[PDB]
Protein backbone atom coordinates (compact mmCIF):
# COMPACT_ATOMS: atom_id res chain seq x y z
CA UNK A 1 0.00 0.00 0.00
CA UNK A 2 1.77 3.10 -1.33
CA UNK A 3 -0.63 4.84 -3.80
CA UNK A 4 -3.99 4.92 -2.02
CA UNK A 5 -5.81 7.97 -0.65
CA UNK A 6 -8.35 6.68 1.88
CA UNK A 7 -11.02 9.00 3.32
CA UNK A 8 -12.74 7.35 6.29
CA UNK A 9 -16.30 8.62 6.85
CA UNK A 10 -18.13 5.49 8.03
CA UNK A 11 -18.07 2.83 10.74
CA UNK A 12 -3.18 3.85 2.76
CA UNK A 13 -2.95 7.47 3.97
CA UNK A 14 -6.15 7.86 6.00
CA UNK A 15 -7.85 11.26 5.78
CA UNK A 16 -10.81 12.05 7.99
CA UNK A 17 -13.17 15.00 8.49
CA UNK A 18 -10.21 17.04 9.79
CA UNK A 19 -8.50 17.46 6.40
CA UNK A 20 -11.72 18.96 5.01
CA UNK A 21 -11.79 22.74 4.73
CA UNK A 22 -15.32 24.09 5.29
CA UNK A 23 -16.51 20.53 4.56
CA UNK A 24 -14.66 20.51 1.22
CA UNK A 25 -11.92 18.06 0.18
CA UNK A 26 -9.80 19.08 -2.82
CA UNK A 27 -7.95 15.96 -3.96
CA UNK A 28 -5.04 16.14 -6.42
CA UNK A 29 -4.80 12.61 -7.82
CA UNK A 30 -1.38 11.88 -9.31
CA UNK A 31 -1.41 9.88 -12.54
CA UNK A 32 -0.15 6.88 -10.60
CA UNK A 33 -2.60 7.17 -7.71
CA UNK A 34 -5.85 5.64 -6.49
CA UNK A 35 -8.64 7.02 -4.31
CA UNK A 36 -10.86 4.86 -2.09
CA UNK A 37 -13.60 6.67 -0.17
CA UNK A 38 -15.71 5.09 2.57
CA UNK A 39 -19.01 6.91 3.14
CA UNK A 40 -22.73 6.82 2.35
CA UNK A 41 -23.18 8.74 -0.91
CA UNK A 42 -26.13 11.11 -0.88
CA UNK A 43 -27.65 10.04 -4.19
CA UNK A 44 -25.52 6.85 -4.42
CA UNK A 45 -24.16 8.22 -7.73
CA UNK A 46 -21.36 10.70 -8.18
CA UNK A 47 -18.62 12.25 -10.37
CA UNK A 48 -20.24 14.99 -12.46
CA UNK A 49 -13.40 7.85 -16.91
CA UNK A 50 -13.16 4.70 -14.80
CA UNK A 51 -15.02 4.48 -11.47
CA UNK A 52 -16.29 1.58 -9.37
CA UNK A 53 -19.30 2.01 -7.05
CA UNK A 54 -19.54 -0.86 -4.54
CA UNK A 55 -22.05 -0.72 -1.65
CA UNK A 56 -21.04 2.12 0.75
CA UNK A 57 -17.65 2.56 -0.95
CA UNK A 58 -16.22 4.09 -4.13
CA UNK A 59 -12.90 3.87 -6.01
CA UNK A 60 -11.65 6.13 -8.83
CA UNK A 61 -8.61 5.95 -11.12
CA UNK A 62 -6.74 9.03 -12.30
CA UNK A 63 -7.05 9.77 -16.03
CA UNK A 64 -3.83 10.21 -17.98
CA UNK A 65 -4.87 13.42 -19.76
CA UNK A 66 -6.86 16.39 -18.44
CA UNK A 67 -8.12 19.09 -20.78
CA UNK A 68 -9.16 21.94 -18.45
CA UNK A 69 -7.77 22.49 -14.96
CA UNK A 70 -11.37 23.08 -13.84
CA UNK A 71 -12.77 19.70 -14.92
CA UNK A 72 -13.41 17.58 -11.85
CA UNK A 73 -15.52 14.76 -10.46
CA UNK A 74 -17.35 15.73 -7.25
CA UNK A 75 -18.69 13.37 -4.55
CA UNK A 76 -20.91 14.37 -1.62
CA UNK A 77 -20.99 12.28 1.57
CA UNK A 78 -23.46 12.31 4.49
CA UNK A 79 -21.99 11.12 7.81
CA UNK A 80 -23.57 11.80 11.21
CA UNK A 81 -26.23 14.06 9.63
CA UNK A 82 -23.51 16.24 8.06
CA UNK A 83 -22.63 16.93 4.43
CA UNK A 84 -19.04 16.71 3.16
CA UNK A 85 -17.95 17.45 -0.41
CA UNK A 86 -14.94 15.86 -2.12
CA UNK A 87 -13.61 17.44 -5.32
CA UNK A 88 -11.26 15.18 -7.29
CA UNK A 89 -9.19 16.28 -10.29
CA UNK A 90 -5.82 15.11 -11.60
CA UNK A 91 -2.62 17.12 -11.29
CA UNK A 92 -2.68 19.65 -14.12
CA UNK A 93 0.21 18.97 -16.51
CA UNK A 94 -0.12 20.24 -20.08
CA UNK A 95 1.23 17.13 -21.75
CA UNK A 96 1.95 17.35 -25.47
CA UNK A 97 0.44 14.88 -27.95
CA UNK A 98 2.95 13.09 -30.18
CA UNK A 99 0.95 12.98 -33.38
CA UNK A 100 -0.33 14.93 -36.37
CA UNK A 101 -3.03 17.62 -36.27
CA UNK A 102 -4.71 17.35 -39.68
CA UNK A 103 -7.27 20.03 -38.81
CA UNK A 104 -6.92 23.74 -39.56
CA UNK A 105 -8.58 25.35 -36.53
CA UNK A 106 -5.87 26.81 -34.28
CA UNK A 107 -7.99 27.41 -31.15
CA UNK A 108 -7.76 23.77 -30.06
CA UNK A 109 -7.31 22.52 -26.50
CA UNK A 110 -4.69 20.00 -27.67
CA UNK A 111 -1.08 20.40 -28.83
CA UNK A 112 0.45 18.10 -31.45
CA UNK A 113 4.14 17.59 -32.20
CA UNK A 114 3.49 17.28 -35.94
CA UNK A 115 0.73 18.68 -38.13
CA UNK A 116 -0.45 18.50 -41.75
CA UNK A 117 -3.47 20.52 -42.91
CA UNK A 118 -5.34 17.91 -44.94
CA UNK A 119 -7.48 20.68 -46.44
CA UNK A 120 -4.44 21.82 -48.44
CA UNK A 121 -3.48 18.44 -49.90
CA UNK A 122 -4.46 17.43 -53.42
CA UNK A 123 -7.73 15.62 -53.99
CA UNK A 124 -7.49 11.86 -54.57
CA UNK A 125 -4.11 11.90 -52.81
CA UNK A 126 -2.67 10.00 -49.86
CA UNK A 127 0.08 11.90 -48.04
CA UNK A 128 1.89 10.50 -45.01
CA UNK A 129 2.70 12.14 -41.67
CA UNK A 130 5.27 10.19 -39.64
CA UNK A 131 5.71 10.49 -35.87
CA UNK A 132 8.52 8.67 -34.06
CA UNK A 133 9.20 8.00 -30.37
CA UNK A 134 12.62 6.89 -29.03
CA UNK A 135 12.95 6.68 -25.23
CA UNK A 136 13.86 3.86 -22.84
CA UNK A 137 10.76 4.53 -20.72
CA UNK A 138 7.60 6.17 -22.04
CA UNK A 139 4.99 8.49 -20.54
CA UNK A 140 3.49 10.03 -23.67
CA UNK A 141 0.24 10.68 -25.53
CA UNK A 142 -0.03 9.62 -29.18
CA UNK A 143 -3.04 10.68 -31.22
CA UNK A 144 -4.39 12.71 -34.10
CA UNK A 145 -6.97 15.41 -34.82
CA UNK A 146 -8.90 14.45 -37.94
CA UNK A 147 -11.66 16.71 -39.31
CA UNK A 148 -13.29 13.72 -41.02
CA UNK A 149 -13.50 9.93 -41.06
CA UNK A 150 -10.75 8.00 -39.27
CA UNK A 151 -9.62 4.49 -40.23
CA UNK A 152 -9.79 2.25 -38.33
CA UNK A 153 -11.18 2.95 -34.86
CA UNK A 154 -8.01 4.57 -33.49
CA UNK A 155 -6.41 3.85 -31.43
CA UNK A 156 -8.17 0.79 -30.08
CA UNK A 157 -7.72 -0.68 -33.55
CA UNK A 158 -4.76 0.22 -35.75
CA UNK A 159 -3.46 -0.45 -39.26
CA UNK A 160 -0.44 -2.69 -39.75
CA UNK A 161 2.69 -1.10 -41.24
CA UNK A 162 3.49 -1.33 -44.93
CA UNK A 163 4.98 -4.54 -46.31
CA UNK A 164 8.15 -4.36 -48.40
CA UNK A 165 7.03 -7.34 -50.49
CA UNK A 166 3.51 -7.65 -51.91
CA UNK A 167 1.73 -8.63 -48.72
CA UNK A 168 -1.49 -7.14 -47.33
CA UNK A 169 -1.63 -5.03 -44.19
CA UNK A 170 -4.47 -5.74 -41.76
CA UNK A 171 -6.31 -4.11 -38.87
CA UNK A 172 -5.18 -5.26 -35.42
CA UNK A 173 -5.96 -4.38 -31.82
CA UNK A 174 -3.34 -2.00 -30.43
CA UNK A 175 -2.92 -4.09 -27.27
CA UNK A 176 -1.70 -7.02 -29.36
CA UNK A 177 0.40 -4.84 -31.66
CA UNK A 178 2.61 -3.08 -29.10
CA UNK A 179 2.22 -5.98 -26.61
CA UNK A 180 1.60 -4.01 -23.40
CA UNK A 181 -1.21 -4.07 -20.88
CA UNK A 182 -3.04 -1.07 -19.42
CA UNK A 183 -3.28 1.09 -22.52
CA UNK A 184 -5.45 4.08 -21.64
CA UNK A 185 -7.62 5.55 -24.40
CA UNK A 186 -9.21 8.98 -24.78
CA UNK A 187 -11.51 10.71 -27.26
CA UNK A 188 -12.59 14.30 -27.85
CA UNK A 189 -14.48 16.44 -30.37
CA UNK A 190 -14.01 20.13 -31.25
CA UNK A 191 -16.80 20.98 -33.67
CA UNK A 192 -16.26 18.52 -36.51
CA UNK A 193 -12.67 17.68 -35.53
CA UNK A 194 -12.19 14.30 -33.84
CA UNK A 195 -9.35 13.85 -31.34
CA UNK A 196 -8.56 10.18 -30.70
CA UNK A 197 -5.39 9.29 -28.78
CA UNK A 198 -3.85 6.67 -26.51
CA UNK A 199 -1.42 6.80 -23.62
CA UNK A 200 1.72 4.75 -23.07
CA UNK A 201 3.63 4.22 -19.81
CA UNK A 202 6.68 2.02 -19.29
CA UNK A 203 9.06 0.35 -21.69
CA UNK A 204 8.16 -1.74 -24.76
CA UNK A 205 8.99 -5.34 -25.75
CA UNK A 206 9.94 -4.83 -29.40
CA UNK A 207 10.23 -1.83 -31.72
CA UNK A 208 6.94 -1.79 -33.64
CA UNK A 209 5.03 0.59 -35.91
CA UNK A 210 1.46 1.25 -37.00
CA UNK A 211 -0.69 3.62 -39.04
CA UNK A 212 -3.99 5.48 -38.73
CA UNK A 213 -5.84 6.92 -41.73
CA UNK A 214 -7.73 10.22 -41.91
CA UNK A 215 -9.91 11.21 -44.88
CA UNK A 216 -11.87 14.41 -45.53
CA UNK A 217 -14.01 14.91 -48.66
CA UNK A 218 -11.81 13.77 -51.58
CA UNK A 219 -8.60 14.40 -49.61
CA UNK A 220 -6.84 11.76 -47.53
CA UNK A 221 -3.84 11.38 -45.24
CA UNK A 222 -2.34 8.87 -42.84
CA UNK A 223 -0.20 9.08 -39.70
CA UNK A 224 2.56 6.48 -39.23
CA UNK A 225 3.83 5.95 -35.69
CA UNK A 226 7.02 4.19 -34.67
CA UNK A 227 8.14 3.39 -31.12
CA UNK A 228 11.36 1.62 -30.16
CA UNK A 229 13.22 -0.14 -27.34
CA UNK A 230 15.62 -3.05 -26.80
Amino acid at each position, epitope marked *: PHNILFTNLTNP*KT*YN*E*S*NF*V*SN*VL*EV*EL*NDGELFVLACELINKKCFQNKIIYHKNLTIFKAPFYVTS*KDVNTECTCKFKNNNYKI*VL*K*P*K*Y*EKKVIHGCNFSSNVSSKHTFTDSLDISLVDDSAHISCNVHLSEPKYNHLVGLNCPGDIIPDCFFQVYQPESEELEPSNIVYLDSQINIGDIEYYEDAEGDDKIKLFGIVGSIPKTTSFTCICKKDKKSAYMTVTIDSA
Partner: antibody
Amino acid sequence: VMLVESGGDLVKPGGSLKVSCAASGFTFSNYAMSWVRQTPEKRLEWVATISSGASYTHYPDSVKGRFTISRDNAKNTLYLQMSSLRSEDTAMYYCGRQVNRHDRALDAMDYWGQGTSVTVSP
Amino acid sequence: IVMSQSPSSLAVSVGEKVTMSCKSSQSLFYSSNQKNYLAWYQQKPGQSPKLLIYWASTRESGVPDRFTGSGSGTDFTLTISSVKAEDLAVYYCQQYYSYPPTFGGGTKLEIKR
Protein backbone atom coordinates in the same frame (compact mmCIF):
# COMPACT_ATOMS: atom_id res chain seq x y z
CA VAL B 1 14.63 28.20 1.91
CA MET B 2 14.88 30.69 -0.97
CA LEU B 3 11.70 32.64 -1.78
CA VAL B 4 12.63 35.59 -4.04
CA GLU B 5 9.87 37.41 -5.93
CA SER B 6 10.23 40.06 -8.62
CA GLY B 7 8.26 41.99 -11.22
CA GLY B 8 6.81 45.00 -9.35
CA ASP B 9 6.38 48.13 -11.47
CA LEU B 10 4.23 51.25 -11.68
CA VAL B 11 1.13 50.12 -13.60
CA LYS B 12 -1.65 52.30 -14.91
CA PRO B 13 -5.15 51.62 -13.53
CA GLY B 14 -7.02 49.10 -15.63
CA GLY B 15 -3.80 47.57 -16.92
CA SER B 16 -2.33 44.22 -15.97
CA LEU B 17 0.90 42.87 -14.45
CA LYS B 18 2.25 39.36 -13.79
CA VAL B 19 4.81 38.97 -10.96
CA SER B 20 6.83 35.81 -10.34
CA CYS B 21 8.36 34.05 -7.33
CA ALA B 22 11.49 31.88 -7.43
CA ALA B 23 11.38 28.85 -5.11
CA SER B 24 14.57 27.12 -3.95
CA GLY B 25 15.68 25.01 -1.01
CA PHE B 26 12.69 22.64 -0.78
CA THR B 27 10.54 20.25 -2.83
CA PHE B 28 8.36 22.80 -4.62
CA SER B 29 5.92 20.14 -5.86
CA ASN B 30 5.20 19.12 -2.23
CA TYR B 31 4.20 22.48 -0.70
CA ALA B 32 1.31 24.78 -1.62
CA MET B 33 2.02 28.46 -2.21
CA SER B 34 0.07 31.65 -1.58
CA TRP B 35 0.32 35.39 -2.26
CA VAL B 36 -0.29 37.92 0.53
CA ARG B 37 -0.07 41.66 -0.07
CA GLN B 38 0.71 44.37 2.50
CA THR B 39 -0.90 47.76 1.93
CA PRO B 40 1.04 50.96 2.72
CA GLU B 41 -1.20 51.12 5.82
CA LYS B 42 0.67 47.95 6.90
CA ARG B 43 -2.45 45.80 6.45
CA LEU B 44 -2.10 42.14 5.43
CA GLU B 45 -4.51 40.89 2.74
CA TRP B 46 -4.56 37.35 1.38
CA VAL B 47 -4.39 37.39 -2.44
CA ALA B 48 -4.48 33.80 -3.72
CA THR B 49 -3.64 30.18 -2.91
CA ILE B 50 -2.57 27.42 -5.31
CA SER B 51 -2.37 23.66 -4.74
CA SER B 52 0.89 21.70 -4.97
CA GLY B 53 0.08 20.58 -8.51
CA ALA B 54 -1.63 23.78 -9.67
CA SER B 55 -5.00 22.04 -10.05
CA TYR B 56 -6.93 23.96 -7.36
CA THR B 57 -6.80 27.72 -6.80
CA HIS B 58 -8.42 30.06 -4.29
CA TYR B 59 -9.11 33.79 -4.53
CA PRO B 60 -11.11 36.15 -2.30
CA ASP B 61 -14.06 38.08 -3.71
CA SER B 62 -11.86 41.19 -3.97
CA VAL B 63 -9.65 39.92 -6.80
CA LYS B 64 -11.82 37.03 -8.06
CA GLY B 65 -11.92 37.21 -11.84
CA ARG B 66 -9.23 39.93 -11.85
CA PHE B 67 -6.14 38.04 -10.63
CA THR B 68 -4.94 34.59 -11.73
CA ILE B 69 -2.33 32.57 -9.83
CA SER B 70 -0.19 29.94 -11.56
CA ARG B 71 2.96 27.89 -11.02
CA ASP B 72 5.57 25.98 -13.06
CA ASN B 73 6.54 22.97 -10.94
CA ALA B 74 9.32 22.20 -13.42
CA LYS B 75 10.75 25.74 -13.41
CA ASN B 76 10.10 25.98 -9.63
CA THR B 77 8.32 29.32 -9.97
CA LEU B 78 5.06 30.88 -8.81
CA TYR B 79 3.26 33.38 -11.05
CA LEU B 80 0.52 35.90 -10.26
CA GLN B 81 -1.28 37.68 -13.11
CA MET B 82 -3.19 40.79 -12.03
CA SER B 83 -5.64 42.23 -14.55
CA SER B 84 -7.86 45.33 -14.32
CA LEU B 85 -5.74 46.65 -11.47
CA ARG B 86 -7.17 49.34 -9.18
CA SER B 87 -5.67 51.94 -6.86
CA GLU B 88 -6.44 49.68 -3.90
CA ASP B 89 -4.26 46.93 -5.39
CA THR B 90 -1.25 49.17 -4.68
CA ALA B 91 0.49 46.99 -2.13
CA MET B 92 3.64 45.08 -1.24
CA TYR B 93 3.01 41.52 -2.47
CA TYR B 94 4.71 38.66 -0.59
CA CYS B 95 5.29 35.10 -1.83
CA GLY B 96 4.54 32.67 1.00
CA ARG B 97 4.62 28.88 1.39
CA GLN B 98 1.80 27.17 3.26
CA VAL B 99 2.47 24.62 5.98
CA ASN B 100 2.38 21.04 4.71
CA ARG B 101 2.87 19.27 8.06
CA HIS B 102 -0.92 19.39 8.50
CA ASP B 103 -2.50 17.77 5.42
CA ARG B 104 -5.00 20.55 4.67
CA ALA B 105 -5.59 22.90 1.73
CA LEU B 106 -5.79 25.97 4.01
CA ASP B 107 -3.01 26.59 6.54
CA ALA B 108 -0.57 29.19 7.79
CA MET B 109 2.63 30.17 5.96
CA ASP B 110 6.03 28.71 6.85
CA TYR B 111 8.25 31.27 5.13
CA TRP B 112 7.86 34.66 3.47
CA GLY B 113 9.58 36.28 0.52
CA GLN B 114 11.42 39.59 0.53
CA GLY B 115 8.54 41.41 -1.21
CA THR B 116 7.94 43.18 -4.53
CA SER B 117 6.20 46.56 -4.59
CA VAL B 118 3.18 47.30 -6.79
CA THR B 119 1.89 50.84 -7.42
CA VAL B 120 -1.33 51.06 -9.43
CA SER B 121 -1.24 54.75 -10.33
CA PRO B 122 -2.11 56.92 -13.36
CA ILE C 1 -14.03 35.87 10.18
CA VAL C 2 -13.14 39.36 11.49
CA MET C 3 -9.84 39.41 13.45
CA SER C 4 -9.35 42.28 15.94
CA GLN C 5 -6.11 43.10 17.82
CA SER C 6 -6.36 45.47 20.81
CA PRO C 7 -4.61 47.73 21.49
CA SER C 8 -3.24 49.47 18.39
CA SER C 9 0.01 50.66 20.02
CA LEU C 10 1.71 49.16 23.08
CA ALA C 11 4.40 51.07 24.98
CA VAL C 12 6.58 48.41 26.62
CA SER C 13 9.68 48.34 28.82
CA VAL C 14 12.64 46.02 28.21
CA GLY C 15 12.11 42.77 30.14
CA GLU C 16 8.56 43.43 31.35
CA LYS C 17 5.65 41.11 30.58
CA VAL C 18 3.60 41.90 27.46
CA THR C 19 0.17 40.60 26.39
CA MET C 20 -1.70 41.09 23.10
CA SER C 21 -5.40 40.41 22.49
CA CYS C 22 -7.00 38.92 19.36
CA LYS C 23 -10.81 38.68 19.31
CA SER C 24 -12.39 36.59 16.55
CA SER C 25 -15.82 36.98 15.00
CA GLN C 26 -16.57 33.23 14.95
CA SER C 27 -15.46 30.01 16.58
CA LEU C 28 -12.17 28.55 15.33
CA PHE C 29 -12.26 25.25 17.24
CA TYR C 30 -12.85 21.93 15.48
CA SER C 31 -14.25 19.97 18.43
CA SER C 32 -12.94 16.56 17.35
CA ASN C 33 -9.45 17.95 16.69
CA GLN C 34 -9.50 20.32 19.68
CA LYS C 35 -7.18 22.65 17.78
CA ASN C 36 -7.62 26.38 17.19
CA TYR C 37 -6.98 27.48 13.60
CA LEU C 38 -5.09 30.66 14.50
CA ALA C 39 -1.54 31.87 13.92
CA TRP C 40 0.63 34.75 15.17
CA TYR C 41 3.22 36.62 13.09
CA GLN C 42 6.09 39.01 13.83
CA GLN C 43 6.92 41.69 11.24
CA LYS C 44 10.32 43.16 12.07
CA PRO C 45 10.77 46.80 10.97
CA GLY C 46 12.04 46.83 7.40
CA GLN C 47 11.47 43.09 7.09
CA SER C 48 8.94 40.51 5.97
CA PRO C 49 6.67 38.84 8.54
CA LYS C 50 7.70 35.57 10.18
CA LEU C 51 5.52 32.84 11.65
CA LEU C 52 5.75 32.39 15.42
CA ILE C 53 2.82 30.25 16.61
CA TYR C 54 0.24 27.99 14.94
CA TRP C 55 -2.70 25.90 16.22
CA ALA C 56 -3.46 27.26 19.69
CA SER C 57 -0.06 27.29 21.39
CA THR C 58 2.12 25.16 19.07
CA ARG C 59 5.11 27.36 18.29
CA GLU C 60 7.31 26.88 15.24
CA SER C 61 10.77 25.27 15.22
CA GLY C 62 13.15 28.11 16.06
CA VAL C 63 10.76 30.41 17.96
CA PRO C 64 11.92 31.55 21.44
CA ASP C 65 10.41 30.04 24.57
CA ARG C 66 9.35 33.41 26.04
CA PHE C 67 6.66 33.80 23.34
CA THR C 68 3.71 31.99 24.94
CA GLY C 69 0.38 32.50 23.18
CA SER C 70 -2.88 30.95 24.36
CA GLY C 71 -6.54 31.18 23.45
CA SER C 72 -9.75 29.32 22.74
CA GLY C 73 -13.02 29.97 20.97
CA THR C 74 -12.89 33.67 20.10
CA ASP C 75 -10.47 34.97 22.76
CA PHE C 76 -6.77 34.72 21.86
CA THR C 77 -3.77 36.27 23.60
CA LEU C 78 -0.01 36.40 22.98
CA THR C 79 2.07 36.70 26.16
CA ILE C 80 5.81 37.48 26.31
CA SER C 81 7.72 36.62 29.49
CA SER C 82 10.70 39.00 29.07
CA VAL C 83 10.73 41.52 26.22
CA LYS C 84 14.06 41.59 24.41
CA ALA C 85 15.14 44.74 22.58
CA GLU C 86 15.27 42.61 19.38
CA ASP C 87 11.62 41.48 19.11
CA LEU C 88 10.13 45.01 19.02
CA ALA C 89 7.94 44.51 15.96
CA VAL C 90 4.33 44.62 14.76
CA TYR C 91 2.56 41.41 15.80
CA TYR C 92 -0.25 40.07 13.62
CA CYS C 93 -3.12 37.64 14.18
CA GLN C 94 -4.49 35.38 11.44
CA GLN C 95 -7.25 32.79 11.13
CA TYR C 96 -7.01 29.84 8.75
CA TYR C 97 -10.19 28.04 9.81
CA SER C 98 -12.30 28.76 6.71
CA TYR C 99 -11.75 30.61 3.45
CA PRO C 100 -10.81 33.40 3.28
CA PRO C 101 -7.99 33.69 5.83
CA THR C 102 -8.30 37.09 7.53
CA PHE C 103 -5.57 39.03 9.34
CA GLY C 104 -5.49 41.32 12.35
CA GLY C 105 -4.86 45.00 12.88
CA GLY C 106 -1.53 44.52 14.62
CA THR C 107 -0.15 45.70 17.97
CA LYS C 108 2.97 47.83 17.62
CA LEU C 109 5.54 47.53 20.43
CA GLU C 110 7.17 50.83 21.41
CA ILE C 111 9.96 51.49 23.90
CA LYS C 112 9.13 53.35 27.12
CA ARG C 113 11.99 55.84 27.28
